[PDB]
Amino acid sequence: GEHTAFNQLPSGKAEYHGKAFSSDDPNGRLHYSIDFTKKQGYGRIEHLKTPEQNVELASAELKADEKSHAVILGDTRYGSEEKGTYHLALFGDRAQEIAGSATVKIREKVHEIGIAGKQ
Amino acid sequence: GGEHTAFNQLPSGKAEYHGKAFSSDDPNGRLHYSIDFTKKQGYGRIEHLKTPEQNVELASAELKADEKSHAVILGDTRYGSEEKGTYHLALFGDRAQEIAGSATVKIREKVHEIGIAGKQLEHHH
């Protein structure tokens, strides 16, 4: 439901699975891990038909945005090279859900990928 | 080519963006978005998604620099004037030719993620 407030973050670690969908491919999958104690998250997009869109969602810090909402802003990578960025927001009293998006630049073309996951 | 617009490379005037709005179950929506570069404000709307409540207003929000000096917009999503969530956009190209990001819409305690992307259709001063 509501955005998880940064100063209301649950304790420990969480694992998320869900969908990754581009404008022409609704069939990708998201895997994402959050360590609430270390304030860190990372994951990956998989199963999109374009191999280069199956990016690593590189290790990034869990921080507050200007509305005090718990967010993660990180880099997207493919073969260890930076391809763009991703933005995730946490939802629920226990950060049960994550949603946001990722960009992947392929041959000077930017691809926008919607991402969503649940514990 | 395809790089983030640096906040100090922003054009002036106003630009209109048209493009796609796509949820995990509906790839056929449309984005309309206006950026007033002089006032550093943007707003728009999502339309043509089959679920009426997903056709949100992307409320007026500030155009600012992110931590990498990239031009971005973070604002609220609304439907019937009520807040439904938030949206984020990033600007791409040396003249902010494109925008891409996403919007969240909460419907009956369920959060819906909508991918959004647009290209400059019109620019005036």
UniProtKB/TrEMBL annotation, chain B:
It comes from the Bacteria. It is found in: Cell outer membrane. Residues 9-103 form the Factor H binding protein-like C-terminal domain. This is Factor H-binding protein. The gene is fhbP. The chain holds residues 154 to 273 of 273 of the full protein.
